Structure formats: C-alpha cells, structure tokens
C-alpha cells in the first residue's frame, strides 16, 4: 500500500538531550605489575581485585572509613607508573577458567603478530588438570617458535581476577598482537585475547613520574588530590611533580609525606608551586599513612548546604601523634607542614593542625578555598559546555549575554547556599575592585557576595584567517574564610 | 531509518558484546541482551518485547523496564566489576544481588542511540504510543467530517479533536507535571512564545500553524497544517542515597 506518510507525518525526538558529566573529587599511582600502563581502574572490590596483602587494600580500607562531620568518599582510582623497562604484554575481565577447555584437544591454532604472522602448532588441553597446566602448555607451544620475542615468552594466569597474560622475551621495544582467525579450533575466545577490549602494551623505557601522571590524566581526569604512595621519592622527583601540578592553575592537589628533618630540605624546592600539600610522618612507627587526610576530607565533601567545611579542626584517631611541644610546632609551621597535634584541655588529650598550602601570594593558601575554586571552575565549565551542546545557536548580541547570564544564574545561586560565597568586611581591596572593574559600586554589591560581567567581543584566530565570536566574563566573589583564633578579656566589676 | 516506530532485540554472548556496540552504536531503537553460554536456550531477548506487549495504554501504565523479575531466565552476571564492564556496552541482563540472605532481576532499560533519541525504553514506548494515537485521531478526523477549512475554525476544531488524547496522556503517566535552565532557554528559543516553559505546571504545550504551499508533483497549491508539541518525558528514579545523622 501507499505509506501513511503521504498524508500524516510525525517526527519524534528528545530536546536538550546532550549529557555532560559532573566532575568528581582520590587517585593512587602504584607500581605493581597487575595494572596495565594504559588504563585507569566503588573496599571489598579492592580486596577482591588486589588481594589482602597488597598496599592498595591497606590504603582503601582506611580511605573508605570516614564521616566528614556531615555523615563518605564512595570511590577510588588506581593508575600505573612504569617504574622500569617493560616488555610487550597482552592483557581478560570475563569470568572464565571453569576447567572447560576440553574439546580444544583437536589441534588448536592461534595467530600472533610482532609485525608479521606467527602461527602456533597443535595445542591439546584435554587433560587440563588445572588452568596453571593450561598456561604452562600454551607457553611450551609458544616457546617452540624462532622469533626472538617468542623464544622465551611467558604465559601466566591470575586467580584473583580472571586474566591470562603473555609477556615477550625482549625488554625495551616491540609490539605484539593477536588476531581472530576463522579456524574452528581457535582459542582466542576461550582466552580473552582479541575479544572485546584487550590491552596491548608496547615496550617502554624507565619513564618519569611527571610524564606518567600526564599519561594517566590523558585518559580520564575525574579526580582530585592524587598521590603516588609507593617507596619514598627523591627530592628532585617531588620537585618535578609539584612543578607539573603548578602548571595547571587550580585543578588538582598533590599530597607528599615527609619526615621532620626532611621538611626543612623541602619548602625550598617546592616553595610556590600552588596546590601542593606537605604532611609530616612519624619515624620508627607504624605506617599509618597520613598524606591521605586532605584527600579524604576533599573526597567526602558533597557540594547540599553548609558544605564549605574547614580543614583545620578535625580529628583522626587512626593516625598517631606527630608534635607535642609549642617550640617544635613553631619551627614546623615555618615550613608550612601539616600534622596531628596533641594539646591538653582539662585532662583530656589530637587533631589536624593547619590547612595551609604552599604557593604564591596570588594563589589560594588555605585548602578550603582551593577546593571551592575547583568546584566553581568545574561547575561553570559544565554549564557552559552543556549550553553549547544543547541549544541550536548562541547569537552574538544582547540576547546572547542575557541567555548566558540566565544559564549561569542557578550555579551562582547554589554557590551562596554552599558557603563558598560569604556575604564580610578592606580599603585596599575596595580600591583594587574599583580599578579592576571600570564600574564603581561593584564592591558594595560584592552585600550580595558576587559580581558578574559578560563581554562578547570578536577576534580572528591564528589557525585560520577567518574571524571567529567569543565571550569574555569576569566574576568577583568574597572567599570563604573560617575563624582560627579567639581572644578576649573578662573585666569584672 | 524509521524514527520511533519499532524495537529490535538482539541476543549476544558476553565476548561478542564488545565487538558490537561499535557497529550498532547510534541506531536508535536497538536493544542488546546478553545470553549465557553452555546453558539452556531460555531465550532472553523477549523480555523487553513481552513487557511492551503486555502494557495497556488504563491509568498508571507508564511502568519501568528496570526493576522486574524473570524467574524463567537464568542468571547472567554476578560481580560488580563484570557489571561495570558490561554497562559500558549498553547490554541488558539479569543480575543477582544479595538482600539479607535472599538472592535476580533485569538490570538496565537503556537503548543504543544518539543524544537526540530516547535512550530509555519506557519513553521510547510512550513516544510510539503517542505517535500512533495522534495519527489515528487525525486520520479519523479527515475520514469523517466533510471538510476542514483553513481558517480559525480549522485550528479550533483540530485542537478540540486532539484534546482527549492529551487528556488521556496525563492519566497514563507519559506526561509528568518535574524540575533545568538550559532546557528553559531551549524552550524559549524553539518557541517564539515565552512562558511556554512555565506551562510545560500542566505538562504540555501545543501549537497549530495552517500554512499554505505548492507540492512538487502538481503545480497546484495544496492547504497543510503544522503542529508542535512539547511535553515533559516520564523518567523513573533508579538510585537512592541518604545519610542518617544521629543526635
């Protein structure tokens, strides 16, 4: 018949459907060989994947217990740092190895390539006492090949997860892959090689920490306050990583753990370098890792009302005491070190003592304002990107400024309720505001807590001669600072 | 090719799932269901089809494709990491979880498609029903009444005829009377009339145009009616979070 569309036509769709994710606020860069270099991986899950002995479970157990005074982090991430030279690898997330490789006793063929094909002879696994035997038998058949990578290649099997891993003989350079063949007796599906998403790792050099963190942030950057947490790093490595962190203005935090004596050696290298935190350890004691306190406090925050919080007065019963003298605390505070201090209050004796970061005059010294600026930048960027993705076009006229301001309004409304905008008493700041903004009486407004402007100018980009427009906005707001000292006098009569 | 007419259910193994979702990415109206290897057939691709077929569009019929139990079908995934890997490929399955000793239900009601298309299956079904009902009412109007004049009486009569369908849509649950600024700006831009977003309090906004044109087949001028409908889709809660502060 003639289709009905000749007479009635209806088109269905979803408007403003473009979803833009929301930024989350810890990531650990370990060195163990379980994690492939090119990936980034909600406590029991960590226990299952890594095992009870690993330091990763040790960290996650203490990380996942936290109350934040407003009743938890609820996520963690791991990435891989290539400490030393590595051989090419091929690495199986699906549950397998139910001891049902039977039926592959009929002359199995598998194909692997360094740069040209290598076919493997008949592999029979009918006996298959265990998957360890299966890996050994695969290794025996692979080692018969005359290619230098495959001459001493190793095949291993992991029980905690369900991964088969193949490692080439040579160290430093090489590329390996596995191909899906058309033969019936091909075990690239019983193995998880060449199916779905398989990580093929090429050979690498010794590599460097600041390059490793950049590679990790390339794949996903939904985190805050990363840390390495392996063996202690050299001072130069800490300097390089702190410089790299300072390269991005107000994105991440970087927590370091030091001894008391080493603290003075630092704060000379890492002076400036906004976004770096130093935490003092206790020598000749349990590990009771402490560099995670700012990271935990940041992770637990939910940006609900009254969420500004304060990093100073907070208690950590797990961590052990660090300093107990006033003169020692005075010496430590010169280096901007964060610690757990103990003080007597009518018999009872311990809390985190300083919430300060190393940085310049222009950067945020306190950690609470640092976190709030991270959240503001992420929220504004999300709203603007979502606007760009949904609406058809944004005209460069008065309607454009009106629409942009209307869209940014809810974020600024929520910012007042959160506590990042304080509606607070200087003359110097008044003059600075009147100079930076041509409009006077902006400082009186910043009564309400903020002042916003939109520009919408035009320009020509360098890449193409064409004129492309652009929007420039300026935001001023009063930061959220908490009282830290109380003084008074009680006059009687 | 047809926008929002049919659904297409496919059954795959776990390993083959990653191979797909590269070919069939986009392609609105396609559903992927994971099978169990080395087990009974216990065909599973029929779950969305059965749920759609049983619906009767009576009050409270919007329903939700997520939380529903299939005792006939066998379990598919049982680890959180495996479920995390599977969800990246938009696969639908039966998951098992412990709730104080007792152990199984369909887990995701998502379809593969683009940003403009309906990812959830419930809104997909409701849009199918809306299109069919509107087309039926308009065709019936054309077939019964003698003529539809291209004047104010025309818009009034067309709106009056479409009114009962939209009345039933509110009772069904396909119209929700729901909280964004971006959506507000989009609505104010798409429709020249501002304060439409405040109206969409009631759940919908409808317009009629009645313009004229000349068709290509014959030189003659033939008229036509253009209508625009905006309504708030029906979305169901899927996650619960809270904090219990004591003292």
Numbering used by the authors:
A (entry chain D): 1 to 25, 27 to 42, 45, 47 to 75, 77 to 96, 98 to 309, 311 to 356, 358 to 431, ...
B (entry chain M): 253 to 309, 311 to 356, 358 to 431, 433 to 434, 436 to 456, 458 to 504
Task: Kindly provide excerpts from the paper associated with this entry.
We determined cryo-EM reconstructions of the extended and contracted E217 sheath at 3.1 Å resolution (FSC = 0.143). Alkalization or spontaneous contraction during purification, observed for ~20% of all virions at neutral pH, triggers tail contraction. This results in sheath compression, with the pitch decreasing to 265 Å and the outer diameter increasing to 250 Å, while the rise and twist decrease to 22.1 Å and 30°, respectively. A secondary structure superimposition of the E217 sheath protein in the extended versus contracted conformations revealed that the N-terminal arms undergo significant movement, with an 80° rotation around residue 24 upon contraction and a maximum displacement of up to 20 Å. Sheath contraction results in a dramatic quaternary structure reorganization with a ~17° clockwise rotation of the β-sheet and extension of the β-strand #4 that becomes nearly straight C-terminal of Gly14. This results in striking compaction and contraction of the sheath that expands in diameter, exposing ~500 Å of the naked tail tube. Upon contraction, tail sheath bodies come into contact laterally, forming a much tighter lattice that releases a large amount of energy. Because of the increased diameter in the contracted state, sheath subunits do not make direct bonds with the tail tube, whose only point of contact is with the gateway C-terminal extension. Sheath subunits make extensive lateral contacts in the contracted state, providing the energetic contribution that makes this conformation thermodynamically stable.
Bacteriophage E217 infects Pseudomonas aeruginosa and is part of an experimental phage cocktail developed to eradicate P. aeruginosa infections in Galleria mellonella (wax moth) larvae and vertebrate models. E217 is a PB1-like Myoviridae of the Pbunavirus genus characterized by a ~66.2 kbp genome, significantly smaller than the classical enterobacteria phage T4 (~169 kbp). Here, we describe the structure of the whole E217 virion before and after DNA ejection at 3.1 Å and 4.5 Å resolution, respectively, determined using cryogenic electron microscopy (cryo-EM). We identify and build de novo structures for 19 unique E217 gene products, resolve the tail genome-ejection machine in both extended and contracted states, and decipher the complete architecture of the baseplate formed by 66 polypeptide chains.
